[PDB]
Amino acid sequence: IVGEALEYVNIGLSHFLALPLAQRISLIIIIPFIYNIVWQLLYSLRKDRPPLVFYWIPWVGSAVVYEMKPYEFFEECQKKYGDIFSFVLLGRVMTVYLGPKGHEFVFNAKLADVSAEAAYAHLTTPVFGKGVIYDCPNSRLMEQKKFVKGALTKEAFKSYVPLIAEEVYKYFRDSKNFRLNERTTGTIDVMVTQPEMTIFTASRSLLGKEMRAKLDTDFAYLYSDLDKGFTPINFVFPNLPLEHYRKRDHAQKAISGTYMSLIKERRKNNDIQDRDLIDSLMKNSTYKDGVKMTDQEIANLLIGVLMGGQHTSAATSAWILLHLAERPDVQQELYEEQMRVLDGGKKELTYDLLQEMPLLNQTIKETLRMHHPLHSLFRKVMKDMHVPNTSYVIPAGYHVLVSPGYTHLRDEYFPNAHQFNIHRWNNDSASGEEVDYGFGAISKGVSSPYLPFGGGRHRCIGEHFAYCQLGVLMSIFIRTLKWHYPEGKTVPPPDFTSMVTLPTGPAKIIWEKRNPEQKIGGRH
Numbered sequence: 001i002v003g004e005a006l007e008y009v010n011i012g013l014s015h016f017l018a019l020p021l022a023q024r025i026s027l028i029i030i031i032p033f034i035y036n037i038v039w040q041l042l043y044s045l046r047k048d049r050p051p052l053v054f055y056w057i058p059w060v061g062s063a064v065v066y067e068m069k070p071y072e073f074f075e076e077c078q079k080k081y082g083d084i085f086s087f088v089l090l091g092r093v094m095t096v097y098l099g100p101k102g103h104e105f106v107f108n109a110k111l112a113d114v115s116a117e118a119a120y121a122h123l124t125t126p127v128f129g130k131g132v133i134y135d136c137p138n139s140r141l142m143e144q145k146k147f148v149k150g151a152l153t154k155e156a157f158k159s160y161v162p163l164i165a166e167e168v169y170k171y172f173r174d175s176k177n178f179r180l181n182e183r184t185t186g187t188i189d190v191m192v193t194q195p196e197m198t199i200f201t202a203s204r205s206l207l208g209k210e211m212r213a214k215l216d217t218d219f220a221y222l223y224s225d226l227d228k229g230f231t232p233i234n235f236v237f238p239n240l241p242l243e244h245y246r247k248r249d250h251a252q253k254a255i256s257g258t259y260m261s262l263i264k265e266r267r268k269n270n271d272i273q274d275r276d277l278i279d280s281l282m283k284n285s286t287y288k289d290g291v292k293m294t295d296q297e298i299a300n301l302l303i304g305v306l307m308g309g310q311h312t313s314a315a316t317s318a319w320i321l322l323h324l325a326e327r328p329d330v331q332q333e334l335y336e337e338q339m340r341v342l343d344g345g346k347k348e349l350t351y352d353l354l355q356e357m358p359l360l361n362q363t364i365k366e367t368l369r370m371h372h373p374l375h376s377l378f379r380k381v382m383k384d385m386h387v388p389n390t391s392y393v394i395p396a397g398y399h400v401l402v403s404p405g406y407t408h409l410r411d412e413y414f415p416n417a418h419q420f421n422i423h424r425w426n427n428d429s430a431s432g433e434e435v436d437y438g439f440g441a442i443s444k445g446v447s448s449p450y451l452p453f454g455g456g457r458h459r460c461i462g463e464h465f466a467y468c469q470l471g472v473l474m475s476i477f478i479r480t481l482k483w484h485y486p487e488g489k490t491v492p493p494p495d496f497t498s499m500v501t502l503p504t505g506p507a508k509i510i511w512e513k514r515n516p517e518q519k520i521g522g523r524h
Ligand code: HEM
Pocket: 116, 141, 145, 148, 305, 306, 308, 309, 310, 312, 313, 316, 368, 373, 374, 377, 378, 451, 452, 453, 454, 455, 457, 458, 459, 460, 461, 462, 463, 465, 466
């Protein structure tokens, strides 16, 4: 009889529940631990699945090494399994496709196969607000990008340049980090100065003088609070009742309120011109089906756009300064180009003249190669995906991870990739077939090993603005200052744990005026 064995199942179950809590706790730990390992071993036998990186701790997965050294994690996995491999990350299964084909697979994936907003809405909506970016369908995002792009034109860039230039000079004059009229040399932390210079220049040009004026008050603290809401932690804990989350939520309310106040006052007073992105979105934010963006949505879009560009650009100008700090030869070469293009300084910097500064633009290009601010980009897989020329199938519910920044640092595609060399872009200082997803014709192929601004439908639309901003900034730094490292100091390693891969601080440089007696004018 085995009927008596079925009885012993029941008995065993009863003797189980009657175990001392010291043991049931252990079993509370050992059972999932064993099950996890047993499951992985079975998983490896499945051949329509990419290799899965082994991990001990359930749910957590490979999260620790990934969060700390993601490029080293990728290279190790790449050696062991090749370009396609999966790993577990704090509850989710991430499928990585390395290299140009990975760029194709993910950046050019069909709209039905993957979703960006499904991956990012929880990180971004709390910070930016509702209705925009990733808190809406893709077709809405496509048109939002179209709206923002319409203020990002050549003619706008020509008007932004003297404005950005003024902000940089005002910063050299008034900021405690410089004070070039009282000081001729000094030390700065680039992770202090660049975020401040970035917000000052982006606000003045994209938002206007009103909004820029507000950064000079206590209101600036709100930006700092909202800023801290942009954190990987939001992927796991997007809302938990602490004061981080309430300073953030308050900031979002307070800042979006401020923009609507300006918007509503501009429209009430017929003061809608072609100054900034606010004027632009006001006279141009009606979707194709006739629905107009609310003033709240418009303000939330401003926040997301300004916030994203803030972190990517500030990290980038910080890296530029850090690389140049140990390369006086490059500073020297850049300075000569400045003297040549601007007639020894007797020419005012214009957007057109920026375009005649290839080495300056190659310096940005090369920094973005070595320091892609977003080391990984994700999509959630919505429908089962077959990986071409493999037997692999990526199930829905998986996430795909693309990482052009990793390919940027491979010798195969960039000879001596870990060496900073702006001349590798000689005759190629620009930041076939095209396609238009709703915000303008962009490249159809996304197979370039160099993709600092991504590609496909989620491609960046701030690239020309970023080059404009960074260009003006670096042009003025180069003409005004020399700089170098404190003894023994060199380029810091990246901090991969933050929202962008900014330098590990404190990252300090020593500056000095090329012209100690040069005075910056204006009232202060
Ligand atoms: C050096 C500076 C920047 C870099 C390297 C950069 C990089 C990127 C990348 C890689 C993406 C694709 C993200 C993805 O595929 O998930 C992206 C998207 C985007 N970026 Fe930028 N960005 C920069 C600056 C800016 C600026 C200044 C703005 C606006 C003024 C901006 C606005 C946007 C927008 C609206 C998207 C679309 C996101 C989507 O469609 O899902 N970015 N950027």
